[PDB]
Amino acid sequence: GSIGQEMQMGDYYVRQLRGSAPLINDPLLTQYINSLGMRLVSHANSVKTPFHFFLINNDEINAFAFFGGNVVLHSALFRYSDNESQLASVMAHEISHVTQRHLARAMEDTWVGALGSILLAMASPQAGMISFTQQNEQEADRIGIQVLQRSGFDPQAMPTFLEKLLDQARYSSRPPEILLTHPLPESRLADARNRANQMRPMVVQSSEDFYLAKARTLGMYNSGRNQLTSDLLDEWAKGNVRQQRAAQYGRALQAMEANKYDEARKTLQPLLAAEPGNAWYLDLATDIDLGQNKANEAINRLKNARDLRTNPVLQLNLANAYLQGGQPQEAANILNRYTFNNKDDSNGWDLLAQAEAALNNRDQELAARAEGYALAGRLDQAISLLSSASSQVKLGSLQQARYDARIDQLRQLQERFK
Amino acid sequence: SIGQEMQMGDYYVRQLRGSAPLINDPLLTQYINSLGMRLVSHANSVKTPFHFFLINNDEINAFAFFGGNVVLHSALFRYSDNESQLASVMAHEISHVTQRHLARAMEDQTWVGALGSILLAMASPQGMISFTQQNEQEADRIGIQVLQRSGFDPQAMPTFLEKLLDQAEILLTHESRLADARNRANQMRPMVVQSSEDFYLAKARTLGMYNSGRNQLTSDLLDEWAKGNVRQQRAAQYGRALQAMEANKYDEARKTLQPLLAAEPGNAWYLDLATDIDLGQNKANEAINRLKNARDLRTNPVLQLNLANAYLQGGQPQEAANILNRYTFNNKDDSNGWDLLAQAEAALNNRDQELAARAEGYALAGRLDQAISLLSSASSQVKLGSLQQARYDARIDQLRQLQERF
Ligand SMILES: [Zn+2]
Ligand SMILES: [Zn+2]
């Protein structure tokens, strides 16, 4: 089965990505990027596979995708994206590469590892490299702009973003890495500007989650050219009030990053007072609270949250608060259900490992950190942890049957690829 | 002619008084028109007298019509950071009238009432008019000079328009035109800018006393004003005393105003609030004596209404009438004087005089038939052939002519 092979070929590369590339595993940022991405996929034609959207800590702008609906976005995209529709146009562009099976159809002409080595070199700040035909790039722009429009974004954002890539391709000695995987001749641009001119004029406003995502990405995961500049923060202090709340949020982050917690708490207060129930400031409200060993206050606030049952960001934030507060069992009650509902989330497993370690449930601790190692492609290491777990439980027990069964599953993943 | 339009203007004004939420505050209306008036005298193409009205509406809007009657929404004060920005709106709106743009627009094509219903809908918080790109490209650039000869900031207009863009109401009735506002302001001159003492207190009383929705006098602004020039610090103290009186914190209100009144005992704003605090504590005698020693007592309309009201609460309706009888003949269109005069004549048991004063209130609010009814009642209580009967019946005649025009 091609779709079956593609989905597990994708899982193999995604596991290699987690284990060696610097992915941003932050709950707020990953939930936003996937919520935005899924909103595009839900308006794409002939989607035959699930989709996941990954974020790299890389200041070089690039974007690419491979089998299984897995698209990779560098954090530099938030530095170049002035509006949400520009970032959406890049994801729409990459989503269309997958639906058209461009990378899959290009490979029909040691080889599984040859492609995986290319994928991580493009994602790592340590950079072979894949390239699409300019015909392929035209289909991705043609199909991407229509997904862009049906999703309620500005179609003129795609040519506007392409032109900003061209103005740095000659006003700078460095060709941005995105232009080498996705080449941009003026024909590509003039074709894009023409299509946008022929759709409906639409002025769209970037969501409030976009500016907060842009602030957290550049502020909290700053790296190289990926900074949250004071020039941009002061510029956001003059724009629409969404950018001002985002600008306030960004300085609260940097005040927390520099351990000026009371300075950060007092900056964050007015935004939390206006929106007491949104996850973005709730997330940092606990972060500053635990920075001062006020874990009870973080717990009380999160138990009063409306959407604690539905929002994973809230669920992890409270589990972490229970851990720092000295109640690991309450953290485990949340995380046992959390890890079962999000088996691919390594944040959940790592926190469960912490909770089970604090409870001195060593077999369950080893099994929890085994899942972290399995998600990172460290299957030999995951098997070692579950072997140790299975050696601490009586034979014939279900814990032994379950630990040994999980080892069996990881061995099958292992033999499918060399 | 100007005659029909001035009379059409009076008809639309009467309709506004009856249905739109006008701010009839003496201090605020005296300031709104005093600033308009010397701003008016710096344009020369004016055919008509000018009156400026303030509407309690938290949605920002401004418009004008026949007879030099301009309408300003109270939301204008929270958008106006300085006196020139506030006059920038008025200079733009008076320039519409002097050049006769709205009259020009309706000469192209039941109509007079349809426009009045629209004028209320814009004014009332609970269909609109819209101007072409030239029309206000006229008004703004014709209005920036009218603002400069009056000694205010020419750059005050542009900073106001940009503060409108990033929030996308005034914008339905009013980048190309905006780029021209910054285009045209930079060329003329840069100007020293200093708001009047009255602008800061007027903004304090509008946002503090007539707070409604987005029209609040926030704890962020008056903390800021306490750090400004000495005019803004006195205004910040005035606003805090005003809000304490609004919250019926009477003792705190007296002690907050005490240093301002001690420094400026003849200031009309503080003298006014000192009466409200005195009457609020049933101390009418103290409020009366303070107002009799005010320097501008028989020249300033705000002080006269304040003392007239204090005489009523103090149990001296005759002395109140002696003031108000003269006030209503000097300020015929002031409904406050007519209402206070009706209260005094009711307390003196001069019934036909009370009905006559009440009638003027209803005539100003556009209910001419009711005013005719009350005067008819007054004329029936007075002897046929008396001078009173001749006046009452003459005023009925004047009101009937008004309603026969429309
Ligand atoms: Zn491409
Ligand atoms: Zn206008």
Swiss-Prot record, chain A:
Free-text cofactor note: Binds 1 zinc ion per subunit.
Localization: Periplasm
InterPro entries registered for this protein in UniProt: Mito/Outer_Membr_Metalloprot, Peptidase_M48, Protease_BepA, TPR-like_helical_dom_sf
E.C. number: 3.4.-.-
GO CC entries: membrane; outer membrane-bounded periplasmic space
Coiled coil (residue ranges): none
Entry keyword set: Hydrolase, Metal-binding, Metalloprotease, Periplasm, Protease, Repeat, Signal, TPR repeat, Zinc
Cofactors, names only: Zn(2+)
Record-level GO BP terms: chaperone-mediated protein folding; Gram-negative-bacterium-type cell outer membrane assembly; proteolysis involved in protein catabolic process
Active site: 94, 141 (proton donor)
Amino acids binding Zn(2+): 93, 97, 137
Observed phenotype of the null mutant: Disruption sensitizes cells to multiple drugs.
Keyword Lyase in record: no
Biological role: Functions both as a chaperone and a metalloprotease. Maintains the integrity of the outer membrane by promoting either the assembly or the elimination of outer membrane proteins, depending on their folding state. Promotes disulfide rearrangement of LptD during its biogenesis, and proteolytic degradation of LptD and BamA when their proper assembly is compromised. May facilitate membrane attachment of LoiP under unfavorable conditions.
SUBUNIT field: Interacts with BamA and LoiP.
Similarity comment: family membership: Belongs to the peptidase M48 family. BepA subfamily.
Protein name from the UniProt record: Beta-barrel assembly-enhancing protease
Classification of source organism: Bacteria, Pseudomonadati, Pseudomonadota, Gammaproteobacteria, Enterobacterales
Curated annotation (Swiss-Prot), chain B:
Protein name, per record: Beta-barrel assembly-enhancing protease
Localization per Swiss-Prot or TrEMBL: Periplasm
InterPro entries: Mito/Outer_Membr_Metalloprot, Peptidase_M48, Protease_BepA, TPR-like_helical_dom_sf
Cofactor: Zn(2+)
Cofactor, free-text remark: Binds 1 zinc ion per subunit.
This enzyme's EC code(s): 3.4.-.-
PANTHER family named among the record's database cross-references: METALLOENDOPEPTIDASE OMA1, METALLOENDOPEPTIDASE OMA1, MITOCHONDRIAL
Keywords annotated in UniProt: Hydrolase, Metal-binding, Metalloprotease, Periplasm, Protease, Repeat, Signal, TPR repeat, Zinc
GO cellular component, one term: membrane
Activation/inhibition comment: Protease activity is inhibited by the metal chelating reagents 1,10-phenanthroline and EDTA.
Source species of the chain: Escherichia coli (strain K12)
